[PDB]
Amino acid sequence: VNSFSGYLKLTDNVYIKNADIVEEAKKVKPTVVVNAANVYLKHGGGVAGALNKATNNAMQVESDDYIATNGPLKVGGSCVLSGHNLAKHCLHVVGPNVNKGEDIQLLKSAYENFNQHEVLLAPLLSAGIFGADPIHSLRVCVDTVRTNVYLAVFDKNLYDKLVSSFL
Numbered sequence: 001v002n003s004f005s006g007y008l009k010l011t012d013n014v015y016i017k018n019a020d021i022v023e024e025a026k027k028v029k030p031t032v033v034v035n036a037a038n039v040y041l042k043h044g045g046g047v048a049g050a051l052n053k054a055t056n057n058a059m060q061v062e063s064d065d066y067i068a069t070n071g072p073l074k075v076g077g078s079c080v081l082s083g084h085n086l087a088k089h090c091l092h093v094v095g096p097n098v099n100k101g102e103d104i105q106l107l108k109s110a111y112e113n114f115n116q117h118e119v120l121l122a123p124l125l126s127a128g129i130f131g132a133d134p135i136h137s138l139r140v141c142v143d144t145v146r147t148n149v150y151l152a153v154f155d156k157n158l159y160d161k162l163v164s165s166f167l
């Protein structure tokens, strides 16, 4: 039993809710919140900009030190950093950005990072400003992630399309 509330169950291990991931994280304080990161951990907009703003820019300060030490992530890769006031940990995962011409097949590799964590609160990778089809992203999620994932979808219209079209 866990503290996630109001989710629709899609499969044995995947759950979905129309929610603001920032508000959901502040209420649940999950062990892991997933950020929709880029390789530079520059959290300017989308999910990343919202999560960072909610940390009063502490996420960005920590991220800049991480990059200065380690260099950029790989597309499809991840790193674990602090969850600040939102979660114990933040798993920064880089899905391909279609608006940068990155290979959509890397979306599966991105979701494989979730399997290193028993339970996660997450957005749909590569959705939103990353330019992928969220229906495709949900399919890859369900077919790749084996651990327990609670997906927060900000847009109510999109949440209903995702549910209604789910096979």
Ligand SMILES: O=C(O)[C@]1(F)CN(c2ncnc3[nH]c4cc(F)ccc4c23)C[C@H]1C1CC1
Binding pocket: 019, 020, 021, 022, 036, 045, 046, 047, 048, 049, 050, 123, 124, 125, 126, 127, 128, 129, 130, 152, 153, 154
């Ligand atoms: O970055 C994008 O465009 C997204 F679509 C946004 N979306 C979200 N998902 C769940 N909660 C969200 N709260 C927010 C608050 C904001 F001010 C802006 C975006 C969100 C948001 C996932 C993200 C996709 C991986 C690309």
